[PDB]
Design a protein around this ligand. Sequence first.
Ligand code: VTX
Ligand code: VTX
Ligand code: VTX
Ligand code: VTX
Ligand code: VTX
Ligand code: NAG
Lengths: 384, 384, 384, 384, 384
Amino acid sequence: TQPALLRLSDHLLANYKKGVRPVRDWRKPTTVSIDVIMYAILNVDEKNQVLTTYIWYRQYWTDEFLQWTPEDFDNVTKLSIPTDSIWVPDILINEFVDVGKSPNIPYVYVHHRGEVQNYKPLQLVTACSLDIYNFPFDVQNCSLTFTSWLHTIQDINITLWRSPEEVRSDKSIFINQGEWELLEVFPQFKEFSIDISNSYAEMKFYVIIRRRPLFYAVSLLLPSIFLMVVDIVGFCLPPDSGERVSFKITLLLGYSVFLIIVSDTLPATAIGTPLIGVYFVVCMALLVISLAETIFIVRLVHKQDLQRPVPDWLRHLVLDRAVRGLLQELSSIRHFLEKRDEMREVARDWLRVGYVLDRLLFRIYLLAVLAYSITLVTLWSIWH
Amino acid sequence: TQPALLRLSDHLLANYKKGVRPVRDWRKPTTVSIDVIMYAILNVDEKNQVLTTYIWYRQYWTDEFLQWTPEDFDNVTKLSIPTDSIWVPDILINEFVDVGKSPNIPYVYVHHRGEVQNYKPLQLVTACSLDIYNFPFDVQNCSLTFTSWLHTIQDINITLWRSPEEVRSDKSIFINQGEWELLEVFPQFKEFSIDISNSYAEMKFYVIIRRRPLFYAVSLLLPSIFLMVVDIVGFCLPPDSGERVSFKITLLLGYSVFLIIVSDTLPATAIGTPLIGVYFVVCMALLVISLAETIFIVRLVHKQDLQRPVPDWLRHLVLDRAVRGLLQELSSIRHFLEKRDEMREVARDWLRVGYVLDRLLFRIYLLAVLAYSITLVTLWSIWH
Amino acid sequence: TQPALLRLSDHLLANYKKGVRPVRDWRKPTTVSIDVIMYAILNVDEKNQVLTTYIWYRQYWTDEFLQWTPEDFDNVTKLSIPTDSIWVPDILINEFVDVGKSPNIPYVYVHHRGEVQNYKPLQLVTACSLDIYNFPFDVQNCSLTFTSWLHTIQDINITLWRSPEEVRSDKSIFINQGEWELLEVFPQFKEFSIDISNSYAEMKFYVIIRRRPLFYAVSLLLPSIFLMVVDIVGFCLPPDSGERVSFKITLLLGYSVFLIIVSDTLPATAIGTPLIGVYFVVCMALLVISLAETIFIVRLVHKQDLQRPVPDWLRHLVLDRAVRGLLQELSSIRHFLEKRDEMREVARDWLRVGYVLDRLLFRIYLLAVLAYSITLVTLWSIWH
Amino acid sequence: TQPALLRLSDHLLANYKKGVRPVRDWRKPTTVSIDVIMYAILNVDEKNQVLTTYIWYRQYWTDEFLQWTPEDFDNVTKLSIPTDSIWVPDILINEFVDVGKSPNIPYVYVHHRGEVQNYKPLQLVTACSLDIYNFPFDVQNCSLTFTSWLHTIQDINITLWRSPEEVRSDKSIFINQGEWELLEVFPQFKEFSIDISNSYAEMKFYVIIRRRPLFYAVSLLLPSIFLMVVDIVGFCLPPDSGERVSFKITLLLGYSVFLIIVSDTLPATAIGTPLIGVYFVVCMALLVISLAETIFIVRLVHKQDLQRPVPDWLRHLVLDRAVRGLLQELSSIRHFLEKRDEMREVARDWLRVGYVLDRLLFRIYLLAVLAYSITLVTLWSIWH
Amino acid sequence: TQPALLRLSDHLLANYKKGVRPVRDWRKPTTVSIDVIMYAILNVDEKNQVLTTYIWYRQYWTDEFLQWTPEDFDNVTKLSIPTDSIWVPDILINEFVDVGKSPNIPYVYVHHRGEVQNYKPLQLVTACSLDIYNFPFDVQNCSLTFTSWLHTIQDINITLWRSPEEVRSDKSIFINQGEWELLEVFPQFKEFSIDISNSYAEMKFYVIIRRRPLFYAVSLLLPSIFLMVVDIVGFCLPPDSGERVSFKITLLLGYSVFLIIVSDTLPATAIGTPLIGVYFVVCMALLVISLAETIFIVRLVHKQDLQRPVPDWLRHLVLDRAVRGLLQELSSIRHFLEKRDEMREVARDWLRVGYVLDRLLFRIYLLAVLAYSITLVTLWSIWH
Ligand SMILES: Cc1ccc(Sc2ccccc2N2CCNCC2)c(C)c1
Ligand SMILES: Cc1ccc(Sc2ccccc2N2CCNCC2)c(C)c1
Ligand SMILES: Cc1ccc(Sc2ccccc2N2CCNCC2)c(C)c1
Ligand SMILES: Cc1ccc(Sc2ccccc2N2CCNCC2)c(C)c1
Ligand SMILES: Cc1ccc(Sc2ccccc2N2CCNCC2)c(C)c1
Ligand SMILES: *[C@@H]1O[C@H](CO)[C@@H](O)[C@H](O)[C@H]1NC(C)=O
């Protein structure tokens, strides 16, 4: 006789119709069992709010036409037949915004009771809501909604292959060393409803992914810390040097270029910018405050050859915390030297005031950045 | 007997022709009812003027060959049959400039009266007219024109599934947290005409989308405001410092780099640049005016050792608003000191004039930027 | 009896062969009439010299096998049959460098005389010659060559559906608000020839597109004008300030960064760079000339404490256009003051010369940029 | 009689079923022999951790239905038949994250014993773990896992065509002049297991690729070396020039721009940044230390007209290693000159201290960068 | 009777098998004649070492089953039949690293002797070895290897349609105005061999393409020449100005930014960087040498108020090539003036030395850049 697989396949696929839903009684829906195993988080685009993942998805349903008695076919209990030869449910993801390029699986396993098993890998580009409020430490909760696109609850119902606890803790194949860490996938069944009669089976997997901040620690924190360090170094220049203000403005321009170039990576959304943006703005205010202090002190100590002398209150407050023709003609010589000396001494008194005030405002700025830095490391421990 | 679905499908699809338009009388057009549900605004490219969206589109038409009496087939009233087994109208969008990658839906529902229901998701890349005059606050009105590509009004006519008010206010599935907010989609029926006989059914959906400015507020307004703040800070430097002009030119270079880098995002069109461009140009004029004032005041107060003394009109106008050999040889000594002192005093008089004029032109510039800023916040309230 | 469309389609498509060219006499070529309607200029890549457009293309040919008498089929005069069921000529564009993603049109109209009408939209990526000599105002003349890829003049000949004047002035559907304005499309028929026998039908449409310069006016002209304005402002700084040369070099660095960033947009070709490049180089020469004048004047007026006094010719040319021990020991005091005063006066004389020469060379540079600017606006009026 | 190939193909492919696994006894698995020949490493994306390669992959299995006696068919021993006409195992790579665009091979060779030979080229985009710890010199070890997607060990088993030593040392077609050098590919057989019964054949090829550092030597090392050279040159400027600190800050800004622009190429991962990042940070610390030394020395030698004189310990430590009205009125003149001279001499003493300390701290910094450079060249020899 | 084309096609394609290689005797290989006509060089990616071209490729082979006597079919000598209806050899390019998007040609010409003619355009992405040693003037020699992927020499042999001299000089359709100029394509036949029996036909076309340097002359040479010009201008600033060193460092930073931005275009390879990189490094050394000369001269002439006087050897070498209380108290006044004057004169002597040495080192640098520029223009003439 002929081989068992040839006889079995010829018996099953003879006068078999792919278009008909395989039920002998049309009132019975084909319950399809869904299982999803996350393999990789290929991309998370916050600008377009799209998530590209790869999953291994296996489903099984009872085909009431692909049934046989194994004892009549040399005790064969299951066989593989082409996917395009049998009816396959139109179960797909609601959140699609594209089609994913994935290998086509040509065969499906069929058991002697009709239990067709369809294993396939598929790449999904799905629209998801991304909360970028705490960008470097954000936890994204994206829904993949498997449902029959056309058939209602009365034709195709969806159940879960494994128990929800098993699929929740499944990380057997996930590519872990990416930017995103898979926390869990959470299945939940519900019915979509257009009206009373048009109700659709639905299975939502809540893929939860946490961003790894070690990708971005160097990218954001290190340059800003450098800039603050150099700013703190810049106060050691004397206020009367004239280069100190140029130093400060050059540093501000550099950190502004840093902000501009970083903004191509730091994303944004309509709900609001990440708190990293707020801390960058606070760093900006700190640098602008340092520049304004430098400019004020430069205005204070300038050798402008016009200064009235320091007022008594200012002086005390600062220093508490620090032959007749020949005779008359020589008098003009000493008067001009005295006029220059008195003017020069006045400029020194302003310089003496401006030096210690530069020191005093350096300590306050030193403490202000110290309090700000300790506040940041405290909040980081909470996010960590 | 055989199962109802097998018998029904075999009866319907036997000697069924896909190429023929399913009408028993060829004079009757197949009225196709169109429904469009916007799911996401994937992209709006102003440079190329193309809009990429995703829609859920459902249509239904009466197939006069897919009719049966349910009482003869075990009371089955509707069944799903493959899309590629039956005639499907060639209804597509006129504004296509590409093909969208969308899932292929294999099945369609058919009721016992022949009412075929085709549900499918599709991504559309369509040419649209984008008015970028008020870029951060623009409201775009893009037309999606569903029509039968080949069949005229005498073969395929297009109606609307739901009432126009229902489709106008449909936001049940729209992904809202993107850059674009869907205001409404507006359906309108009209007939395209090549001649008297060649008239085509047409249904234009006017997708109206408003850009969310919170994406761009930080991107444009914040750096410019920073630059103006630093410019205002720069006036506190003394005019005779010599660094003030370097400060101003460095700031101008920084803001020019800001303009250059921002222009990769701020789009343009043949109709005209956005008013944001005009306000950036006005900010540019303000910075150039501040730089010119700095350069003029520096030219005024310079210690050039060549100045003639301040004219009487200028002085008043500004200050209203603020042994014989031994004897003759010593006279040369006091004369040279007097010559230096008189020259030094003249330089001081120019400095006294230039100081208050720097203050006076600082107040005017302070008020000019204040009036400009209040004007901007007033117009923003209207756009908001 | 059966419906007319079913009977007609069954009669036509029974024993119909798609592979055969539909002529009862094989000597008669199938004359295909071509019509092209430009819809959008999607992209013009000057770097790769490729033009991506979208067209609505309709063709019609006489199929001698799809003929019937309408009075025998309930007076049906035309019917739509699937495109993949009948012979379709292999007419495509010679200039292809890719395949365009375009919707597939499933049906074609067939009249009772056999006149098959095939309407289809198609995106074309075609190699074209782009003359970038006058880049902002260039008029590109790109050829789309529709021809039968395989069949010679003896099998497929190509004619034009409409008169050439009608297709020349066709702008009914063109998307006008893009960067490119369609001037006309010009059809011309010719025969390609490999040898005497192997001659091919050919129809060249000369798509002529003019770039809209309002896209680029802001992008190129405005920043350069700004830079020149600031350069003109920079001369007001005194030559002895020392900051003027730093101002000029900073401005030159800024405009060089402008040139670098702009070059990512301004294209180039082997024939030659656009004249915009030449005018940018002339602006570069103007800025370098201003910098060299600043450096020369700074070298002239420096307080170098070493200057020999101004020569008589230079002075006139410039100013035409502007007790014994006690006695001897006091003499040394007045001599040292005289030595310093004479040296100081010499430095003033050089400064007096350098000041007016700075003014004189400022007027010449002011006129040179004025002549250059008026020359540019004159040539712009010709291009406009 | 008919030609041998026609008769043989007609005999083989008559009543041949593609869906059945070609075994006369269904208990016998189809052992498929796998061979992989690497052709090119198209891309290694460290950001997404994906490897795109091209391979020539040949497989062979025994088809028990495609068997014939050559003496009955004119001594034909093998023939090519279309790939889509016979059963082909569903062997693919587990690590897929996309589908590769590769030519479709239409034919396969079949020998008279049934040995089908399938040669095909395929592009693979596979997820791989990339260790970027020593980025310029890293050796990546990426797994390509060929397995039957559906069939278990009981239906399809996988062996190796050639001996493992032959495939390990195979570089016959590899494109060598790319960025990556193929060290070896290592085959290893194992069984995947879902449970006791569901075990799958598996063949892992460990493609080992070493990056060529000559691509990146110029990109990273050369600019940093330049920056250090210029920094070393900058110490030759006198500390009192005032421009030295501006020189240092400008150099620091330039090298920071270098770091920013380079970071678009230097990748990162969650495990940790490459040691090149650590050496760049050490270079950053060196530049900041040089800037701080410059600022400290500038603070030390400033002509601030306020300095108390150098303390005795500091001085020694540094220098070890380097008519009554007329009479009284003239006394004021010499006193004022003495007051200025003593103040001027004090400023000189501070300058004398700061000069040699600048030299002394220049030698230490010269030795520190020398030790750092020699340390780098030593470690480079180990990596080389 | 029926039309000739219908009868002929029905006679030929009845019981015609596509899978069989069309030979009546299986020992006779099907000699396929190859012809390749280059149409465009779409892209040359030196980073990935891939060449994307477009070719018109025509092949012809003798099909021994598609033969007829024309006198029996109304004297028809050739006819077009669908490509997918007849056997087509699996000839493709070995160097594929992708699949090219090209139009599908549906028909092929068949003559009455069986000579099938297959014309088709195809885009090829092929791995090629790119020698970037002389990047702007490089001549690339890339191999396209047409061979039968599966069939050996015993089944499919490959010959050339035209004589090798005709295909060598073929430029009839090449798009010439691109970046690459096609010098020639060179065909050569060889046999690949796996073993003694498994030998494969092979035809290598050596596409030779020369880069047009006019694309890049402006891109590289012009900015560097500008930078050198400005550097030469910078020497005219006096050494004691203090701004000269700032000028030089700003220029160096600008040219470094130029190098950084240019490196995104100038490619690299493992064999070695292009000589343009070496000349850029030499320009870098020239700028660093100019900066070091400026810093040295600034160190030489500084008004540091500490200089010992110029040594006798240095001076000559440089200048060869250029009442008791009242009496004693007045003596202190002249002594202090003498002390200041002698110190001031010493600073002048150092300035006199440093001025001419700046001139002398300017001439040497002027000649060094002149020799370097003449050397470059000489080598350019050889490359040109
Ligand atoms: C008002 C309204 C009516 C029906 C729907 S449903 C839908 C609409 C178009 C295309 C497909 C569907 N679906 C049906 C089953 N579920 C998958 C998608 C909606 C959303 C609104
Ligand atoms: C002058 C003219 C004639 C006919 C048309 S129509 C058209 C033309 C080519 C291809 C398709 C069409 N269409 C027919 C039905 N509507 C969808 C597209 C035009 C625009 C101008
Ligand atoms: C020397 C030569 C011979 C023939 C041609 S033609 C050609 C060649 C290959 C593939 C296609 C064609 N074509 C035939 C009909 N026209 C469309 C393209 C040439 C150019 C040179
Ligand atoms: C818990 C668990 C169960 C089964 C698998 S396997 C798998 C799952 C879905 C789709 C395909 C597969 N495969 C089967 C044979 N090998 C190739 C892929 C896993 C991973 C976990
Ligand atoms: C060791 C070795 C054996 C065979 C080959 S050949 C080859 C291998 C796999 C897939 C295809 C081929 N080819 C056969 C005919 N020529 C085109 C490609 C090699 C390279 C090494
Ligand atoms: C099938 O299995 C049964 C036991 O399960 C055994 O008795 C019978 O012999 C088997 N048939 C064949 C053909 O092996």
